[PDB]
């Protein structure tokens, strides 16, 4: 099995690219995946799963006691036979909210949820700090590669740039790699060139662009990923590619991190000298 | 003293609003301030500083010891006299990243540093998790008052909706505050009217509207601030206004969050489909 970690900026497309990807490597390419949502906000499998919130790991251990809590009370199957789990944390400001991710990954681990018949695990992960439960698919080797979307926005090339600082530190030792860079395009001129670069400076690649396709919103409306909401539209054939690819990547490299200063330099280039990035 | 925290997503504006706000107290309302960076970016007070790259009090702990990490080595004064410290905080993947928030308050409290001659204190925290340092003036009392820059992107939102959760569960006990949400203009149309239902719906007043305007920018190559850069120019103006609002404000409340369903579907409402909010 091959575990995946999905890093970048909050609201920058994780869910989206993650979800659409994992559909396309099961419906397109005949792939058994799990998708393991690793991010507080806990709506990373709710298209998958046709809607559904699943009830998260941290909830049933609350709920049903540690003596009850085991992976097929937190296991839910969805479209193309994707199986799902929701880690949840603690209430904003109640504890650590990376401390769910890390007690559902163990629980997952204990019981060989990812060696089970699996080609295929993604964690989609919050990537705006890494600590905690966070740098768990970094620090302690709990994925093998790890994929960032991003975009031309300076906090999005911040969040890749510092899970790329995490790898130079415990990659060694962890045995991940850096498989390379998503562009989610915001439609913004520029950014495909700036995550090229970005990409080049880092010792990476920039494995796909990823257009802007409001078909995703038209999906979300009725509770489907693209792939499945359509799967001959050009966005469904755009996540084919992208899993193509990353089925297909021999790339792995551990990344030379930029420094503030040149991703200051590297924004401006571009004209986002507003790092929000809202015109090219 | 007034101690206020600014919350929000990361590139909301935090920063920005906050050092600008600040200037503004400083220059145009005579009044003695104090920035405390509290996101481990840590450059949330060089354009009060003129460029000036902080040394963080983490970093100064782990060079100098705790008997010789003393405010006076870490504190700098800047533009209005407003007083500036960064916590810092440890490398990606190394610790807690809120870690030297702790540390850093805990210090500049046990110094009395907040109540050495200053009407205000401004916080300047991530907001993306609310956890570790980032928490503490929302749970353990450490702020006054809160104000959230926000704007029409879904996860603006989502932290801001963060925050009220956070002060359902301590602002009771914590003493802590909602005075309002501020709207940094992405320059998208309907921001207004979306932010301000939203503050109508978790019970709190939408303060003001920051327009988008690239003074930003052209004060930032000169490393100041736009009042410091400008004073009669027209966002110096707005930052005036703000600061006046803060100054006088008495609208603090406990806040009602809203559900992620209700959220989706305000944004929804407003035509904020793709919630990353350009166009
Ligand atoms: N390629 C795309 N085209 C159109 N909309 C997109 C695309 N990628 C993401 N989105 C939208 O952007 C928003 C953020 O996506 P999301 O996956 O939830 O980000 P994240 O998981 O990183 O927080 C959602 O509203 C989603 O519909
Ligand atoms: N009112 C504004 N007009 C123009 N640009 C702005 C405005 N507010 C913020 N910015 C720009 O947006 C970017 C993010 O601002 P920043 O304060 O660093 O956000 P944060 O501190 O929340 O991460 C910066 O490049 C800044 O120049
Ligand atoms: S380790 Fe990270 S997620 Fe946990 S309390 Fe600290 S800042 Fe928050
Ligand atoms: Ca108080
Ligand atoms: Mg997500
Ligand atoms: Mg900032």
């Given amino acids: 099995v091959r575990k ?3 890093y970048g900026k909050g609201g920058i497309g994780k869910s989206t690219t993650t979800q659409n990807t994992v559909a396309a490597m099961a419906h397109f390419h005949d792939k058994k995946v799990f ?17 559904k919130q699943q009830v998260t790991m941290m909830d049933t251990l609350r709920e049903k006691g540690e003596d009850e809590c085991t992976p097929d009370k ?3 199957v969805g479209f193309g036979g994707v199986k799902c789990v929701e880690s949840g944390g603690p209430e904003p400001g109640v504890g650590c909210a990376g401390r769910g991710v890390i007690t559902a990954i163990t629980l997952m681990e204990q019981h060989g949820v990812y060696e089970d018949d699996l080609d295929f695990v993604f964690f989609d992960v919050l990537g705006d700090v890494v600590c905690g439960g966070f740098a768990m698919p970094v620090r302690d080797g709990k994925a093998d590669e790890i994929y960032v979307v991003a975009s031309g926005e300076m906090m999005a090339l911040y969040a890749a740039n510092n899970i790329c600082k995490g790898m ?3 990659a060694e030792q ?3 790699r850096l498989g390379g860079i998503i562009c989610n395009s915001r439609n913004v001129d520029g950014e495909l060139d700036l995550l090229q670069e970005f990409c080049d400076k880092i010792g990476t690649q920039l494995i796909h662009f990823v257009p ?7 999906a979300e409306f009725q509770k489907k990923a693209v792939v499945d909401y359509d799967d001959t539209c050009n966005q469904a054939l755009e996540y084919k590619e992208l899993a193509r690819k990353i089925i297909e990547n021999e790339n792995l490299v551990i990344p030379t991190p930029m420094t503030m200063d040149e991703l200051e ?4 280039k571009y004209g986002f000298l ?4 809202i015109e090219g």
């Fill in 4 to 6: 995946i970690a999905i």
């Fill in 212 to 218: 802007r396709d409001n078909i995703v919103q038209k």
């Fill in 35 to 51: 998708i393991h949502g690793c991010d507080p906000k806990a709506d990373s499998t709710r298209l998958i799963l046709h809607g």
């Fill in 174 to 176: 962890s045995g991940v």
């Fill in 74 to 76: 937190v296991i839910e």
């Fill in 265 to 268: 330099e590297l924004t401006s």
């Fill in 168 to 170: 130079v530190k415990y």
């Fill in 274 to 277: 507003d790092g929000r990035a």
